[PDB]
């Protein structure tokens, strides 16, 4: 049926090539459902496999989440959250990460799941993707 929402969006502002002075958000990810559910995961697909942005120059940059924990074993971020309230997460690069003046891509799949004793079952899912084009700095 449908109360399950997911938005995933590249960052609006300018991002400039070079060593980032601080943590810089690449992607905004917002997720909620007022239906009962036990939590969320984000699974990076294709060349993003492993939690990476891939650039047009062939470089892989690792991404980081504020709200979710990474598990390499499973190729996902996840958060157990039973709330009807929206999760506003950001995926970001860390202070000091060197970016180039190029276009960076991410693709993944978002899953919503429920626990049954006590093992998770996917109840909703949506494929997400986006890109940032980084400008010459700096
Ligand atoms: O709680 C459900 C999530 O579990 C994650 O799996 C691991 C994880 O490393 C950690 O929470 C630990 O307690 O063991 C779990 C073994 O299943 C999944 O990676 C995630 O997708 C959720 O299912
Ligand atoms: S890889 O090992 O540098 C790499 C990059 C990014 C992630 C996700 C952030 N936890 C994992 C591994
Ligand atoms: Cl992370």
From Swiss-Prot:
It comes from the Bacteria. The keyword rRNA processing does not apply. Coiled coil: none annotated. Keywords: Fimbrium, Signal, Virulence. One of its GO terms (cellular component) is pilus. It is found in: Fimbrium. Induction: Expressed inside macrophages under acidic pH and at 37 degrees Celsius. Transmembrane segments: none annotated. Forms a homomer composed of subunits assembled in a large structure. Fibrillar structure, part of fimbriae, necessary for full virulence. This is pH 6 antigen. It comes from Yersinia pestis.
């Amino acid at each position: 049926m449908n109360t399950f929402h997911v938005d995933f969006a590249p960052n609006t502002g300018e991002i400039f090539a070079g060593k980032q002075p601080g943590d810089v958000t690449m992607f905004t990810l917002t997720m909620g459902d007022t239906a009962p559910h036990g939590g969320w995961r984000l699974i990076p697909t294709g060349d993003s496999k492993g939690g990476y942005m891939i650039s047009a120059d062939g470089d892989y940059v690792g991404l980081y989440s504020y709200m979710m924990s990474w598990v390499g074993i499973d190729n996902n971020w996840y958060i157990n959250d039973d709330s009807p309230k929206d999760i506003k997460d950001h995926l970001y690069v860390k202070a000091g990460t060197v970016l180039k003046p190029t276009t960076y891509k991410f693709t993944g799949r978002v899953e919503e799941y429920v626990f049954d004793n006590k093992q998770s079952t996917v109840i909703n899912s949506k494929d997400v993707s986006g890109e940032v084009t980084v400008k010459q700095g700096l």
